[PDB]
């Protein structure tokens, strides 16, 4: 995988979104864009909250995305604008990139992406340009609009710079740079954005970053349903809490199994080190970790550390004062979840006479797990997932981080309309509810 992001040559006018964008850029900057860039958002089919644990996921890119009209400038001046009034213009000319985790203002996600590229190539000077941002992904809704902006911003930067990177590399870089926002997430979102391929789903693996086509089942529609509960990951610690929780769990797991925990960072590492299977890993966990919650002193104790080292050498800023750590539950979640993913696939590769039904299950399982073990669901998500089921839903589960956001659901061909209607009907009574297909990845667009 040395292939880079593609370059579509276009006649602007044939693309309404584009020409519009072109028109407003001009209005905003007195010039026309030199080029454009898009990076889709995505739907995680299954395998939630395990990317950061080193485990493989199965998402697919959505068609919604972030489109940026770009114009390079000779100055050290970065001017960002957004077609959406909710997103104020932003400018800077500083080589020193200042990202505020205090109020993740939209523009900061753009800076993460730009900043990562600059650093990748050891650059200090700000890359001057004018950009008009245009995203159609519902914000803070589980669809990775943050990552779309991130990746898009990165691609743009690289293009302006006129340097080259593989899609992989891009994904890898944008996975790390997004953290500048304050989130300690994995790499599923960026990887799918850069690696997506139309008409197929992907099994994204990590270390090494790899993607593998996954042919979806033949008779069901994947339907995104937005709970309508907004979750801004960067605005709230829940996420990082879970990140810590697992990290801690893994360390303790290693300790127990007598490995080198000090080096351990992720849950899968433990499974790796032991040479055991997922199922076995579940038994380990069951032995190693007590259900009742762990505490900071107890933790310290177990590891032969100091609260200060905890705090210091291990904890996160936004997790320092946590009293309660649910190591057992998070691990139970993680380990099973990886197993489902590997399963779901395998199935997909077999095509059994009861495919959906099966897969459906796998999916309900993810949900409950996330719900009960990982505790990253919500009451709203909870109902939505039922109702869905209530109408045809062969598979329903929250998607993305959770705590609001969307849900994905395998509705079989024929119930769609009802689903659609009844759901619409129940929950609701295109924007919040709609069907999906495996979209393609990030691309450069040249008016040619
Ligand atoms: N069109 C857009 N323009 C500017 N900023 C955007 C746009 N779309 C998304 N964002 C930014 O991205 C933020 C949402 O980030 P985030 O919390 O990660 O939600 P998400 O990416 O949709 N879901 P998830 O996959 O679970 O991480 C918003 O608060 C905005 O700051
Ligand atoms: C950008 C970011 O942190 N992405 C993460 C992704 O890595 C994954 O953990 C997901 C839950 O499965 O929640 C987030 O959106
Ligand atoms: Mn996000």
Swiss-Prot record:
Gene3D superfamilies assigned to the protein according to its UniProt record, in alphabetical order: 1.20.1440.340, 3.30.230.10, 3.30.70.3170
InterPro entries hit by this protein: Galactokinase, Galactokinase_CS, GalKase_N, GHMP_kinase_C_dom, GHMP_kinase_C_sf, GHMP_kinase_N_dom, GHMP_knse_ATP-bd_CS, Mevalonate/galactokinase
Reaction(s) the record says it catalyses: N-acetyl-alpha-D-galactosamine + ATP = N-acetyl-alpha-D-galactosamine 1-phosphate + ADP + H(+)
Sites where the protein binds alpha-D-galactose: 42, 48-49, 51, 189
EC number, as in UniProt: 2.7.1.157
Keyword Nucleus annotated: no
Major enzyme class: transferase
Gene Ontology CC terms, in alphabetical order: cytosol
Example of a GO MF term: galactokinase activity
Iron-sulfur as UniProt keyword: no
GO terms under biological process: carbohydrate metabolic process; galactose metabolic process
Residues annotated to bind ATP: 142, 144-145, 232-233
Covalent S-S links between cysteines: none
Site (Transition state stabilizer): 42
Entry annotation: catalytic residues: 189 (proton acceptor)
Superkingdom of this protein's organism: Eukaryota
Pfam family name, one: GHMP_kinases_N
Keyword terms, alphabetized: ATP-binding, Kinase, Nucleotide-binding, Transferase
Subunit record text: Monomer.
Function field: Acts on GalNAc. Also acts as a galactokinase when galactose is present at high concentrations. May be involved in a salvage pathway for the reutilization of free GalNAc derived from the degradation of complex carbohydrates.
NCBIfam families: gal_kin
Annotated family: Belongs to the GHMP kinase family. GalK subfamily.
Protein name: N-acetylgalactosamine kinase
Organism of derivation: Homo sapiens (Human)
